[PDB]
Write an enzyme that holds these catalytic residues in place. Structure first.
Site, PDB file in Angstrom:
ATOM      1  N   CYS A   1     -63.702   7.740 -47.068  1.00  0.00           N
ATOM      2  CA  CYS A   1     -62.949   6.555 -47.444  1.00  0.00           C
ATOM      3  C   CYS A   1     -61.438   6.684 -47.342  1.00  0.00           C
ATOM      4  O   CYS A   1     -60.729   5.692 -47.496  1.00  0.00           O
ATOM      5  CB  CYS A   1     -63.326   6.120 -48.861  1.00  0.00           C
ATOM      6  SG  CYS A   1     -64.984   5.452 -48.950  1.00  0.00           S
TER       7      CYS A   1
ATOM      8  N   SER B   1     -76.915   7.273 -58.048  1.00  0.00           N
ATOM      9  CA  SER B   1     -75.913   7.406 -56.991  1.00  0.00           C
ATOM     10  C   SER B   1     -76.260   6.623 -55.721  1.00  0.00           C
ATOM     11  O   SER B   1     -75.437   5.849 -55.223  1.00  0.00           O
ATOM     12  CB  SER B   1     -75.689   8.878 -56.637  1.00  0.00           C
ATOM     13  OG  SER B   1     -74.692   9.455 -57.469  1.00  0.00           O
TER      14      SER B   1
ATOM     15  N   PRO C   1     -60.816  -0.437 -51.733  1.00  0.00           N
ATOM     16  CA  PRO C   1     -61.651  -1.040 -52.778  1.00  0.00           C
ATOM     17  C   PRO C   1     -62.899  -0.214 -53.040  1.00  0.00           C
ATOM     18  O   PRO C   1     -63.982  -0.628 -52.632  1.00  0.00           O
ATOM     19  CB  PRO C   1     -62.084  -2.350 -52.132  1.00  0.00           C
ATOM     20  CG  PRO C   1     -62.241  -1.980 -50.692  1.00  0.00           C
ATOM     21  CD  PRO C   1     -61.138  -0.983 -50.401  1.00  0.00           C
ATOM     22  N   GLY C   2     -62.771   0.929 -53.693  1.00  0.00           N
ATOM     23  CA  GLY C   2     -63.927   1.785 -53.887  1.00  0.00           C
ATOM     24  C   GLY C   2     -65.058   1.093 -54.622  1.00  0.00           C
ATOM     25  O   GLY C   2     -66.240   1.342 -54.365  1.00  0.00           O
TER      26      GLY C   2
ATOM     27  N   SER D   1     -66.154   1.619 -46.459  1.00  0.00           N
ATOM     28  CA  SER D   1     -65.588   2.957 -46.346  1.00  0.00           C
ATOM     29  C   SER D   1     -64.193   2.868 -45.720  1.00  0.00           C
ATOM     30  O   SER D   1     -63.376   2.043 -46.127  1.00  0.00           O
ATOM     31  CB  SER D   1     -66.496   3.866 -45.511  1.00  0.00           C
ATOM     32  OG  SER D   1     -66.072   5.219 -45.592  1.00  0.00           O
TER      33      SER D   1
HETATM   34  C1  LIG Z   1     -65.810   6.848 -49.655  1.00  0.00           C
HETATM   35  O1  LIG Z   1     -65.144   7.885 -49.668  1.00  0.00           O
HETATM   36  C2  LIG Z   1     -67.241   6.773 -50.217  1.00  0.00           C
HETATM   37  C3  LIG Z   1     -67.925   8.151 -50.270  1.00  0.00           C
HETATM   38  O2  LIG Z   1     -68.404   8.562 -51.322  1.00  0.00           O
HETATM   39  C4  LIG Z   1     -68.053   8.993 -49.003  1.00  0.00           C
HETATM   40  C5  LIG Z   1     -68.227   8.026 -47.843  1.00  0.00           C
HETATM   41  O3  LIG Z   1     -67.254   7.670 -47.175  1.00  0.00           O
HETATM   42  C6  LIG Z   1     -69.611   7.451 -47.569  1.00  0.00           C
HETATM   43  C7  LIG Z   1     -69.544   5.979 -47.917  1.00  0.00           C
HETATM   44  C8  LIG Z   1     -70.835   5.184 -47.725  1.00  0.00           C
HETATM   45  C9  LIG Z   1     -72.030   5.670 -48.535  1.00  0.00           C
HETATM   46  C10 LIG Z   1     -73.091   4.618 -48.255  1.00  0.00           C
HETATM   47  C11 LIG Z   1     -74.470   4.706 -48.896  1.00  0.00           C
HETATM   48  C12 LIG Z   1     -75.017   3.376 -48.400  1.00  0.00           C
HETATM   49  C13 LIG Z   1     -76.401   2.884 -48.768  1.00  0.00           C
HETATM   50  C14 LIG Z   1     -76.349   1.491 -48.124  1.00  0.00           C
HETATM   51  C15 LIG Z   1     -77.512   0.528 -48.323  1.00  0.00           C
HETATM   52  C16 LIG Z   1     -77.037  -0.748 -47.613  1.00  0.00           C
HETATM   53  C17 LIG Z   1     -77.911  -1.992 -47.752  1.00  0.00           C
HETATM   54  C18 LIG Z   1     -79.345  -1.940 -47.259  1.00  0.00           C
HETATM   55  C19 LIG Z   1     -79.907  -3.329 -47.550  1.00  0.00           C
HETATM   56  C20 LIG Z   1     -81.365  -3.490 -47.142  1.00  0.00           C
END
Ligand SMILES: *C(=O)CC(=O)CC(=O)CCCCCCCCCCCCCCC
Ligand SMILES: CC(C)(COP(=O)(O)OP(=O)(O)OC[C@H]1O[C@@H](n2cnc3c(N)ncnc32)[C@H](O)[C@@H]1OP(=O)(O)O)[C@@H](O)C(=O)NCCC(=O)NCCS
Lengths: 352, 352
Positions: free
Chosen positions: A137, A179, A277-278, A311
């Protein structure tokens, strides 16, 4: 160095948060967690998100090999769209680009995305490539800072950043844990590109975006656990520590003061804040820590609400929104992002 | 931009090629392929390799999650060792570093390897990080070019590159197909670091050189399939086309002439060649295409023989070897690497 073009690109599939949640809770292995899913999705301050695949397709996306292959195809498409838009905004062409940096954390490409984008748009064969993976991010802000570092060394050049984050395609790694589920509440899909030129280039042709004045990184000691990926056969699984906000509340003000001090500025000298916007608790933490006015982060809230958390791409969408409100000529802007490290990145801008 | 330190680090498990081959043909699923395995392993002109794990542990390394966890653990150790070594060569300290770039293609780390190495060595919190992922075998050369691009705009600064490639840990993705088996013949484990300083800093620290003068990328159109990873649940599976050598033979001379022309130089002006040891056929293709004498690439052959192909780290080991041999003072040097893209990178040097 001076920004000349900024552009955001989103996948065509747009859904309200309620739509996503309604479908999501019926996906295999999720029904038993309906209540916590609805609760987290509802508290996210996200009203809608763009997704790179139609909603119904996600239950079939259980294999990381499938997901990552789709990532590669879709990310190159969206990255190209964003770069073209930014080039049009800058009145420049692909062949003008001397260096391209790409940022992503949501997929693994070798050859990198920049090589694939270069090929698609017909960038010069000698274009300098900078594939930035793993900043997460922070990469939107950090990426802009790297463009400045390049252009300070090459003041006649044009350099571009392309951020593409397809968070939904990490679905194969999603689990019914707090998480991961927080992740499914917050993250959307999208891309953004910045086109920048060196100071001499800016004196040769017109660049209308803000000046990139300076930047400062801040890597926090002993904080590897704050955020990152768990990487495995199921792909990329979100690790997010509950200590994140406490870290922000405890240290962010010092990051800002240290940086602004060097420019003999105070937080009251900055006329436009451009923050990542975290999520609601994070944005709250930023506003509290820096004692910002209530509307300081309005465009950050608005973006999170409209498209979710993209992100590294989100801060670039917010930068574009900020540029469009046409801030007071000559005033200071401050980009603020954070990410795996744990780290923050600040970038000082001057509008006009 | 002047190099002040170059240093290589290898894991302690060292085996002869014969020992590696003898064990490998007896690994689960491989005895049927003994003939081709012995052929490829002998043809590699590699006499030994260092491995991050005991040789007989690899059959148990079937899960990408385990392997990538081991990658992160071992890669940080080797990167730290390498960087500390280069800093010692340069007579500089961790706190002197203004920017750190890392290069790997053999594992996936978020937070990135640079964040981890920065933490372990106590780099300044404001150190600029550049985690380069996906350049593959070109990254030793490209990384050095990236240091130049940074230091050109920051003449008082110190910038470092750390390459860590643990090719053996991609074993979970290995199957007995020709492309994978070719990889098992050539690639070993290791790391390297380069410490460079700005032109203004160079006198102050008595940097030993060589000078980094310029660089040129060459990305070959429609060539993404030539080399790269196919990524999935089993990790990082080598894609490598037999057509690679043909592309070099057809186009390398032009890459080099286009670059040297711009500096009014000829091949005959090059006092020392520092070329990446892709494999015997690749090295032959380089010599043939450039009409070089046999001794020109001798240190590249030697490195291949001694430690195998370390992806992005090899050219840095060869650069160190070259510096130690001391080419004619004031003469030109040329780094030459190639990798996923498909691409080549050239770096122009001047020896001390
Ligand atoms: C930014 O630093 C956030 C972080 O912790 C590290 C990073 O950049 C990864 C950011 C994305 C993590 C996403 C997990 C997403 C699960 C998404 C589900 C989407 C919707 C599905 C709907 C059927
Ligand atoms: C591995 C190596 C040393 C073996 O040499 P060798 O036993 O003479 O084998 P050859 O190169 O002559 O090739 C023999 C056969 O294997 C095939 N082959 C070679 N490499 C292959 C690959 N990566 N994938 C699939 N097939 C391959 C050849 O096409 C050839 O096929 P054929 O029977 O139809 O003629 C040699 O292939 C080599 O050095 N290749 C270059 C390595 C490389 O690409 N490094 C990357 C640089 S960045």
């Amino acid at each position: 160095s001076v920004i000349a073009g900024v552009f955001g690109a989103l996948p065509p599939h747009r859904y309200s948060q309620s739509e996503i949640t309604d479908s999501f809770v019926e996906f295999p292995g999720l029904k038993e967690h309906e209540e916590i899913i609805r609760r987290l999705h509802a508290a996210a301050k996200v009203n809608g998100r763009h997704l790179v695949l139609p909603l119904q397709q996600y239950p079939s996306l259980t294999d990381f090999g499938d997901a990552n292959e789709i990532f590669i195809e879709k990310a190159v498409d969206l990255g190209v769209e964003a770069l073209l838009g930014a080039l049009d905004d800058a009145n420049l062409r692909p062949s003008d680009i001397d260096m391209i940096a790409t940022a992503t954390v949501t997929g693994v490409a070798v050859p990198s995305l920049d090589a694939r984008i270069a090929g698609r748009l017909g960038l010069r064969p000698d274009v300098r490539r900078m594939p930035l993976f793993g900043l997460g991010c922070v990469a939107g802000a950090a990426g802009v800072a790297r463009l400045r570092d390049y252009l300070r060394g090459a003041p006649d050049d044009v350099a571009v950043l392309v951020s593409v984050e397809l968070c939904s395609l990490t679905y194969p790694a999603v689990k019914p844990t707090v998480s991961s589920l927080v992740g499914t509440a917050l993250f959307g899909d999208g891309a953004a590109a910045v086109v920048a030129v060196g100071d001499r280039r800016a004196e040769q042709v017109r660049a209308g975006g803000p000046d990139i004045l300076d930047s400062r990184s801040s890597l926090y000691p002993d904080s590897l656990h704050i955020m990152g990926w768990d990487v495995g056969s199921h792909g990329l699984r979100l690790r997010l520590s509950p200590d994140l906000t406490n870290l922000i509340e405890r240290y962010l003000a010092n990051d800002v003061t240290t940086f602004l001090d060097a420019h003999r500025l105070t937080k009251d000298d900055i006329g436009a804040w451009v923050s990542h916007p975290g999520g609601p608790k994070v944005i709250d933490a930023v506003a509290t820590s820096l004692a910002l006015p209530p509307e300081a982060l309005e465009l950050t809230w608005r973006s999170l609400g409209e498209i979710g958390n993209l992100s590294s791409a989100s801060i670039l969408h917010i930068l574009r929104d900020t540029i469009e409100k046409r801030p007071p000529s000559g005033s200071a802007g401050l980009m603020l992002a954070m990410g795996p490290g744990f780290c923050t990145e600040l970038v000082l801008l001057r509008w006009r």
